[PDB]
Amino acid sequence: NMLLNYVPVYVMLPLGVVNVDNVFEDPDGLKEQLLQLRAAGVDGVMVDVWWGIIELKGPKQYDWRAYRSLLQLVQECGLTLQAIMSFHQCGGNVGDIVNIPIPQWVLDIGESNHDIFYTNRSGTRNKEYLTVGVDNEPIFHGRTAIEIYSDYMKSFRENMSDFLESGLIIDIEVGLGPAGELRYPSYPQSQGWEFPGIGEFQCYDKYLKADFKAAVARAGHPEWELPDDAGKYNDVPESTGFFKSNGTYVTEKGKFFLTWYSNKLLNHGDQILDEANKAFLGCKVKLAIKVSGIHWWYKVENHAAELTAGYYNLNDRDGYRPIARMLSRHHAILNFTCLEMRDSEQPSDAKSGPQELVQQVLSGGWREYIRVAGENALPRYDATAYNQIILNARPQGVNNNGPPKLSMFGVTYLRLSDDLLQKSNFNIFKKFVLKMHADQDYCANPQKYNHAITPLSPSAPKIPIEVLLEATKPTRPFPWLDETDMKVDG
């Protein structure tokens, strides 16, 4: 059945649907837009549940009213919802319309303790998210950062108990860093970064510096210090001592730092997912995380952009499969991106390989037997972009006698706006939805398209770091079709 080949399509809501004052401003305008999405066959929508809005009043002071109103409207429209536990800042760069910083009471603490923020070698602090260095430091009026995220999700589960009961919310995406992604804020626009800069390492706050200092001493190398020859945000690999040919990144010291640096993210995600499993135990929802798509410099030996981000990915070291294996124990979904990008669309000087990157991440996930979903990186309204998404949603096409050989769990499109609703753009979008649905009409019963809806089970036993790292062994990705068999046109 083509219904077994049906992949659900979700649409990201406009930023600030619930404003910084914690008010659901334009119910009527959003409703008009949602009714049209529903008419296009869209399965559901996605929304950031901003930490900066909900717990703004003060510690453990949660106001869910406006959001409950938003969820009530989504339900009345007959759409499902993907909720992002957004523990990061919204916008923040010159040009961003909607700016939602993390809670002010947290920023106040930051004023007297600048090390709660991610920090570069030059000492600049990024206030968009709390460094992994304070995940377990009880410096937030008694609570650790992880306890903050844990109490937040629990209050959400309790206050949204009816919506979770009704099956409105189908999955909870746990924000794990800048832009909600599990990574270091290595390419900040606010600090001058410009594509395709290699970015900078962000492990200099006192907490991680002490962490690294203890780690090297145990390795019997107290003389090793954090990186000092990595260059800056906009440099290119070969112009640095760390990333150039036979540079520091290939030394015993370099490889130890990179392993230490990337492991912090694996554990950061594992610990926080543990709390999410506890918070949502028994609810009919799936957990998920967002992995960033660093496609620039993917084409060269150093993979510099990925390394400073926290993904220790090299020609001979799979830096992504270990993340998938970590997600295994939580039965979580790996939400990726760059689904609409083609290498031909990137400037050659960027040494960009989004197509190859998507293939590696998706293949890794499927090898670890977890679900993989994804989004488009940049706004696109053209057929060429949609065809690439459809290709990635079912790499080996449709299967006439059963579910597809390979297929993403779902796709979330960025982003709902009036431009998407313009006649020309919308008519192409409607075709994209149809194709993602394998030429079938919207279907309300997930069973019809192989999406088992079950109560969240407790996490499986902890997987030791060394076992997770066995997944760094290089493996050939699954073969991909060159062009999809379900083009929006022919």
Report the phi/psi class of residue 371: left, alpha or beta, with left for phi > 0 and alpha for psi in -120 to 50: beta
SS3 (DSSP) at 266: helix
Helix axes 206-218, 252-280, angle to 10 degrees: 120
Is 259 one of the annotated binding-site residues? Answer: no
Q: Which residues contact 483 (CB under 8 A, 6 or more apart)?
A: 387, 391
From the candidates 55, 128, 173, 181, give the one annotated as an active-site residue: 181
Name the nearest CA neighbour of 29 among 416, 423, 414: 416
Q: What is d(CA 394, CA 438) in angstroms, rounded to the nearest whole number?
A: 10
From the candidates 55, 275, 340, 375, give the one annotated as an active-site residue: 375
| Tokens describing residue 402 | 């059963």
> Which alpha helices (H) appear in 233-369, and where do they start and end?
252-280, 304-309, 321-328, 354-367
- Count Cβ atoms below 10 Å from residue 155 Cβ, excluding itself: 17
Q: What is d(CA 363, CA 479) in angstroms, rounded to the nearest whole number?
A: 9
- Count Cβ atoms below 10 Å from residue 105 Cβ, excluding itself: 16
Can you tell me which residue has the tokens 């597809």? 404
* CB-based contact 397:486 (threshold 8 Å): yes
Q: What total of structural domains would you count in the chain?
A: 1
* CB-based contact 125:118 (threshold 8 Å): yes
| Tokens describing residue 374 | 């994804």
Is 337 one of the annotated binding-site residues? Answer: yes
Q: What is d(CA 81, CA 47) in angstroms, rounded to the nearest whole number?
A: 8
Is 93 one of the annotated binding-site residues? Answer: no
| Tokens describing residue 252 | 């015993």
* CB-based contact 256:220 (threshold 8 Å): no
- What dihedral angle (degrees, nearest 10) is formed by the CA atoms of 263, 266, 269, 273? -130
Resolution of the structure in the document, Å: 2.1
> Which alpha helices (H) appear in 413-455, and where do they start and end?
423-436
Is 377 one of the annotated binding-site residues? Answer: yes
Active site (annotated) includes residue 375? yes
CATH number of the domain that residue 179 is part of = 3.20.20.80
Q: What is d(CA 11, CA 14) in angstroms, rounded to the nearest whole number?
A: 9
Inter-residue long-range contacts of 457-461, CB under 8 Å, 24+ positions, other chains counted: 457/331, 458/277, 458/281, 459/273, 459/274, 459/277, 459/329, 459/330, 459/331, 460/328, 460/329, 460/330, 460/331, 461/329
Give the end-to-end CA distance of the chain in Å, rounded to a whole number.
21
Q: What is d(CA 47, CA 70) in angstroms, rounded to the nearest whole number?
A: 10
Looking at 13-90, which runs of residues are DSSP E strands?
44-50, 80-86
Name the nearest CA neighbour of 442 among 44, 114, 130: 44
* CB-based contact 235:197 (threshold 8 Å): yes
Which DSSP symbol is given to 238?
A: G
Q: What is d(CA 352, CA 348) in angstroms, rounded to the nearest whole number?
A: 7
Q: How far is CA 19 from CA 46, 84, 97, 175, 372, in A?
A: 16, 16, 11, 19, 31
- Count Cβ atoms below 10 Å from residue 419 Cβ, excluding itself: 11
Range of the domain at 204: 1-490
Is 96 one of the annotated binding-site residues? Answer: yes
Q: What is d(CA 41, CA 35) in angstroms, rounded to the nearest whole number?
A: 10
Is 290 one of the annotated binding-site residues? Answer: yes
- What dihedral angle (degrees, nearest 10) is formed by the CA atoms of 37, 41, 43, 46? -20
Q: What is d(CA 446, CA 456) in angstroms, rounded to the nearest whole number?
A: 16
Is 489 one of the annotated binding-site residues? Answer: no
Active site (annotated) includes residue 32? no
> HSE of 65 in the Cβ direction (CA atoms, 13 Å)?
8
Do strands 117-119 and 125-130 pair parallel, antiparallel, or not at all (unpaired)?
A: antiparallel
